[PDB]
Design a protein around this nucleic acid. Structure first.
Ligand SMILES: Nc1ncnc2c1ncn2[C@H]1C[C@H](O)[C@@H](COP(=O)(O)NP(=O)(O)OP(=O)(O)O)O1
Ligand SMILES: [Mg+2]
Ligand SMILES: [Mg+2]
Length: 428
DNA sequence: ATTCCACACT
DNA sequence: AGTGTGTG
């Protein structure tokens, strides 16, 4: 009763850019705007691999991981933009710089946690408290929430158009709000959504990029909410919406349950939906999935999660890798050294820029390889000191730490992947 | 022949 | 450390 926490203590948003690499390319090249379009890496093998897809192209069935030649079978007029290639590999610099544009705008509203190249979590609890004090008991107009969906509404007794439904649900929600009581979680989420509308408007005005967002009480629900009405919309998932939302929600849709652990939850417990987890005791879940996973699942299926929005706007590592599939696997010592150099040169360029922008220096170099035949993504990891931002030195050091893996002037078994990653940053 | 960050476990 | 999972 009065002592059961409900995980309604925070307001958390997740902002995720819509078809992000495609929008970067469409901003640059107006000929690509409002067209079925995709971004590809490489070109020689089957037209290149698609990594981002405009919503117009998705309507034809084009997806990420598809070869462009195959995508063109579904969508003959598909337009393509190619990722920059430097030193023999795809180079994502343009998208990292566009990401910085967006993250710097978001950081004006609140502390953000950079969760990927195109998304960040936002802890809005304080901003909401401030805005509720500014508001002075004044009701919130639907005009302040022009692109917001309230998950679960409308319910109960222009209904056949999407925007009509969005407005009906929003009206039900605002009609129900207690705009007195500044401690109401639903009111806090609603003010959060007002702020997120402002944040998304700022991103679009100042960059040209559209994005979606989720607003809820924690990161998992915010992330889930964001995807519910992409693109160019935001979704509020209230605590009270959780039981119905989760009652038909496949377990794999919840962040960190998309892989083996989620599969084992389904297999061991014989369930399909997140809500079914509520029927197990915390001890039962811990016995199957461990203390940490069990406690997390027990709270998460009730809409409760405590993972904090970490104050971290910058990546903690700077890495780059290249695959060498099938017959292209590296089979000579010289080949291995040349590609280690190419990777080290990209890494040096990125590290030097990072040191100037962010007042820090990496202190450890991590080298990872994959050998032909190994089913695992990475076969071996080794590390060494990173004492100078020098590509020739870094590539020589990586070779020194991996050369004894060579069973064999010849390299055996051939290498199917190289990976250099700078880690352990200290202030400079 | 999909390609190119963060964190748990031991 | 080094291995592995999950993410986007
Ligand atoms: N598996 C992958 N391999 C390579 N690049 C990838 C990738 N997944 C994503 N990227 C890159 C390319 C993506 O543009 C960018 C953001 O990833 P998302 O947010 O998952 N997908 P998007 O923003 O495109 O569409 P929307 O959010 O509207 O569904 O990261
Ligand atoms: Mg996105
Ligand atoms: Mg994303």
């Amino acid at each position: 009763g009065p002592h059961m926490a409900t995980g309604q203590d925070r307001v958390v948003a997740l902002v995720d850019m819509d078809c992000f690499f495609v929008q970067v390319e469409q901003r640059q090249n107006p000929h690509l705007r409002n067209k079925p379009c995709a971004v590809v890496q490489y070109k020689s093998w089957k037209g290149g691999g698609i990594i981002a897809v405009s919503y117009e192209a998705r309507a034809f069935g084009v997806t990420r991981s598809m070869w462009a030649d195959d995508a063109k079978k579904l969508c003959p007029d598909l337009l393509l933009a190619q990722v920059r290639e430097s030193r023999g590999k795809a180079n994502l610099t343009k998208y990292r710089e566009a990401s910085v544009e967006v993250m710097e705008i978001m950081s004006r509203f609140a502390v953000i946690e950079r969760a990927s190249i195109d998304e960040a979590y936002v802890d809005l609890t304080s901003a909401v408290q401030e805005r509720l004090q500014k508001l002075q008991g004044q009701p919130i107009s639907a005009d302040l929430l022009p692109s917001t969906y309230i998950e679960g509404l409308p319910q109960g007794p222009e209904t056949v158009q999407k925007e009509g439904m969005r407005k009906q649900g929003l009206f039900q929600w605002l009609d129900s709000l207690q705009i007195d009581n500044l401690t109401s979680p639903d009111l806090q989420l609603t003010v959060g959504a007002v702020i997120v509308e402002e944040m998304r408007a700022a991103i679009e005005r100042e960059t040209g990029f559209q994005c979606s967002a989720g607003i809820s009480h924690n990161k998992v629900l915010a992330k889930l909410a964001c995807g519910l009405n992409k693109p160019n919309r935001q979704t509020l998932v209230s605590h009270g919406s959780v039981p119905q939302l989760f009652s038909q929600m496949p377990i794999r849709k919840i962040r960190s349950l998309g892989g083996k652990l989620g599969a084992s939850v389904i297999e061991i417990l014989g369930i399909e939906y997140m809500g079914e987890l509520t029927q197990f005791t915390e001890s039962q879940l811990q016995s199957h999935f461990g203390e940490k996973n069990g406690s997390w699942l027990y709270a998460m299926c009730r809409g409760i999660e405590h993972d904090p929005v970490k104050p971290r706007q910058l990546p903690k590592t700077i890495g780059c890798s290249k695959n060498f599939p099938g017959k292209t696997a590296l089979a000579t010592r010289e080949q291995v050294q040349w590609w280690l150099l190419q990777l080290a040169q990209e890494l040096e360029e990125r590290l030097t820029k990072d040191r100037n922008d962010n007042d820090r220096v990496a202190t450890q170099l991590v080298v990872s390889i994959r050998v032909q035949g190994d089913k695992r993504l990475s076969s071996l990891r080794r590390c060494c000191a990173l004492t100078r931002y020098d590509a020739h030195k870094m590539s020589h050091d990586a070779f020194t730490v991996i050369k004894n893996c060579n069973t064999s002037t010849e390299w055996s078994p051939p290498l199917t992947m190289l990976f250099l990653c700078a880690t352990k940053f200290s202030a400079s």
